[PDB]
């Protein structure tokens, strides 16, 4: 090969950027204006598409006083309640009449064909020594999900043990972007646990694929907005194993969790509580083995220039603990075993977001933070990567 | 679309790295014992293949005492003769006999098939206000090859009005890479003369492709060494023009030279003086209109970590002047009109480096800076885009 | 096997050109693994990152068994490498009448810690307290002015001594018995301690006791040409200006390091605090380290803190806990004959 | 005369071709110190071409 390098943030303008202002000439053309008193007959948001087209909704109003509408469950008192909703997340919740007739927007934005949504204000913001991490940092005779990896200037975390879906089908690992790709060197070379300029270590492989930004009309599948410059940011890189490296010293087992299932696939047409409100787990080499729960999928954030940004998955830890720290970026997020079933992957951690983000409560407890993540499964057909689970699958395609 | 960084330069490593034992020991290796009295017969004549696959043979002996070796002419007394040779760039010549037995290397290195090489010692050392440049940086009513471009961070120069060879066949302009792309985040929308955060300007379009590193197996077509991590520095970015912008105010004419013909290609198998010693010209936004001569081709240097880097073309200015300044990266290099024939392009200026070893001499004159640059033909072969020169072909 | 000072020390100086390039610095006191130390002697190797041996190159791997002159063998293993609101802070830096074995010594810009009581053998056994070789010897002053809690320029000033004895470079062979390093140039890290009481300063208050342990035995002469129980794996205390009353344990010995250039200097007896707590902190490089009272017998201070090592590095023992700090030290049996001294443990014969 | 004499440190030219009177009547060359040999090594090399 050589190199390559196609499309930065910049391509896909007129023709389509007006095929988006066509389907959206009706976030109000189908209904009966504000009829307070009951529950817009029609029905109610019973999905996350059903409720994706409703913050997608009256978006001028919502996007007027806000910082990032999302889409979870009516949160109330302090614990997810079970009624779909539109978290007009804010800077700091407040009182009623002390408001300039406009600052606690209305809890009844409506929809396309009688679909009324629900609003409830929250407020937002922007090494753990043990022996389950002292092994992953290159002190155990088997590598796999969670192991330390570094190339020349960055430190990351070994993700899943992957294999391609095409002509060659090499076997490597799905790490993230900031630990993989740069260009001052003609090639990128990872090393475990350290490169030869930082300490000991052995050769791992080279980067051969990457992606950093995807437009939403192909990622999510729906327009999901009114500003047509939407970029659903994702992160992944296949890294084929070297020809000299011993394959026998690879374990396809998450040390700390157990045995993985296959894949959890998020399709936005299903009961809403099927993914939101479910316990999750994660093993990475900056926290050990932590646990959390899904809070609200499909966060939106549009910055000053007007660039759309959807960040898929929001997770907040359990029992007031942090889900991850800086350095855990790249570790798989695993759906907690559902009473006898094997645990399943739902996403790679896009980043621990150091202190970038804080889903706060008006209850008597401090600012517990959150974390992010990508939809692993729509990142598996954008890099043609696959999830390998059984340890007899490692020596089954390489063989 | 999206984003997507590929990079399989990795296409080497084991299956093809033993496939490079045809350099030594195998086939093109120990061939027919040499001889003294019978000077190598003569070594035929005309070739880059004729004299690269001799320099490729003894790369270790050369590299033992060098600063990089290219293929040019046997420079004697300062001028350019017709005897093919290789210039081994060095720190300093020094006397003939106060050497340890080898610092002035033997000039009789041989190759595969009884062809003897030839060596040299050169010594290597690791605006322009007028009205041809103020008509490029904003004060004009037409855009084209030579005009200034800036995206949101840096500044560049329009290369040439180009169109894609496949798909929808979009029409834009081929600049170099960091007028656009760079690192940590891409470079997406290019303005002329400036983006709206620096002054006035208009939208042109957006980058859509690009390249940056190639392997010395597919670019030149021959191994050209023994180091299996040899790389070609290439620089390009196709930029389809925007829909709102009027295309009726675009001129595919280089103001200052005239009108170019079609691309000239180097085939590495021809009389060697057909490209070396030829007068070349250019048009830039920071120098204006300068002329020069091609001194040597196929530069080669491997750095400390041990990866070779071929930098194609070496161009030095005429009458002791400099070809360019640090404003000209992206400008086309055009062969000077050969007595009535229309000029033809040979490469985009990779950048006025001229600091990784100046072409020095022992004549009574200071160092003269040179230029680098891709050999166009195989850069408009990778991104699959041609060059529009006729003012009526642009309309169609 | 190995049971003697030289049994390790001369193996060290022979394999030294075969030792110490895989990693910087190695200590030879005992084999430690599985969390604790066993009775197996060794040449334990400090490493930056403890990589499992499968991720190692054969040349730079661990040679488990080494052998040299005579017919004595040994073993090799791996180690890693890189306030107090109590009574004693107030009553050794101020509010106490007298100075006992660990009163804070206040330099112009630094502060150290009282050690033990000097004497001499030749000429005039002049009496003055002794402390380390960075508090007093500055990079700008050949001599410096020492005095109880704080100096005159930052507090109420009433002073104690001025340096004439300032030994810096101790030679190697007269000090560690035999050749220790195959590298030609290695003098010693030789922070010494002798310094007057300043002639007329009151002597009726100067008491001979450590405030928190009591009566201490004498100077001990180090001898590991006896069984390993003499110096390795022992229990030691800690009394200091900044740290308190902690109890440490002796792990290492003559360990030499390579800081930036590769300066390999003799970092004498190393101790680590118990219960995974810091042994000492900054400004405490004058505190004595006694062997614990062995069944009634009055304890003996072998060690002196050589410097503030809280910011130097830590050795991790991988026992589900973070890296724990280590402290340097200098043998008192060596300094005692370096500078003509005599340690006094009792009070009746201070002026005799 | 005129030719450089440079060994490490920095570089300098050659003073002259000279003869000593006292010692044993030999031949040498003269040097100007600061460009070389001042105090670091009064007994180090002096090289022509380059060291």
Curated annotation (Swiss-Prot), chain A:
UniProt keyword Cytoplasm, yes or no: yes
Top-level taxon of origin: Eukaryota
Phenotype seen when the gene is deleted: Narrow leaf phenotype. Reduced leaf blade width and plant height. Altered internode elongation pattern. Altered vascular patterns in leaves and culms.
Usage in biotechnology: Utilization of photosynthesis-related QTLs can enhance high-yield breeding and provide a new strategy for achieving increased rice productivity.
GO cellular component assignments: cytoplasm; nucleoplasm
Protein's UniProt keywords contain Secreted: no
Keywords assigned by UniProt, alphabetized: Cytoplasm, Developmental protein, Nucleus
Subcellular compartments: Nucleus, Nucleoplasm; Cytoplasm
Biological processes per GO annotation: internode patterning; leaf vascular tissue pattern formation; regulation of leaf development; stem vascular tissue pattern formation
Tissue specificity annotation: Expressed in leaf sheaths, leaf blades, culms and panicles. Preferentially expressed in vascular tissues in leaves and culms.
Principal cellular location given in the protein's record: nucleus
Function: Involved in the regulation of lateral leaf growth. May be involved in the regulation of basipetal polar auxin transport (PAT) and vascular patterning in leaves. Controls photosynthesis rate by regulating carboxylation efficiency and consequently photosynthesis rate. Controls panicle and spikelet numbers, and grain yield.
Name this protein carries in UniProt: Protein NARROW LEAF 1
């Amino acid at each position: 090969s050589a190199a390559y390098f196609l499309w930065p943030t910049s391509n896909l303008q007129h023709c389509a950027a007006e095929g988006r202002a066509n389907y959206f000439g009706n976030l109000q053309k189908g209904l009966l204006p504000r009829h307070p008193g009951r529950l817009p007959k029609g029905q109610q948001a019973n999905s996350l598409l059903d409720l994706m087209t409703i913050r997608a909704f009256h978006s001028k109003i919502l996007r007027r006083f806000s910082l990032g509408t999302a889409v979870g469950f009516r949160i109330r008192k302090g614990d997810l309640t079970d009624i779909p909703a539109i978290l007009v997340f804010v800077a700091r919740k407040v009182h009623k009449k002390w408001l300039n007739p406009a600052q606690c927007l209305p809890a009844i934005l409506e929809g396309p064909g009688g679909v009324w949504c629900d609003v409830d204000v929250v407020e937002f913001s922007y090494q753990m020594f043990s022996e389950l991490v002292d092994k992953l940092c290159g002190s155990d005779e088997c590598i796999g999900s969670g192991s330390q990896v570094a190339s020349h200037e960055t430190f990351g975390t070994l993700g899943a043990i992957v294999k391609r879906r095409t002509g060659n089908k090499q076997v490597g690992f799905l790490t993230n972007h900031h630990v993989a790709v740069d260009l001052d060197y003609p090639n990128q070379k990872m090393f475990h646990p350290l490169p030869p300029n930082l300490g000991p270590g052995v050769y791992l492989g080279a980067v051969e694929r990457a992606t950093s930004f995807i437009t939403d009309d192909v990622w999510y599948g729906i327009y999901a907005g009114t500003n047509p410059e939407t970029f659903v940011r994702a992160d992944g890189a296949f890294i084929p194993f070297a020809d000299d490296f011993d394959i026998s010293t690879v374990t396809t087992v998450v040390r700390g969790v157990g045995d993985i299932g296959d894949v959890k696939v998020i399709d936005l047409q299903c009961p809403l509580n099927s993914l939101i409100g479910r316990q999750v787990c994660k093993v990475g080499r900056s926290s050990g083995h932590t646990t959390g729960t899904v809070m609200a999928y499909a966060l939106e954030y549009n910055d000053e220039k007007g660039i759309c940004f959807f960040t898929d998955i929001l997770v907040v830890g359990e029992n007031r603990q942090t889900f991850d720290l800086e350095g855990d970026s790249g570790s798989l997020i695993i759906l907690t075993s559902q009473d006898g079933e094997k645990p399943r992957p739902i996403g790679i951690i896009w980043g621990g977001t150091a202190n970038r983000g804080r889903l706060k409560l008006t209850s008597d407890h401090g600012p517990e933070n959150w974390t992010s993540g990508v939809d692993l499964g729509r990142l598996l057909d954008r890099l043609e990567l696959d999830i390998i689970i059984t340890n007899e699958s490692l020596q089954d395609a390489v063989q």
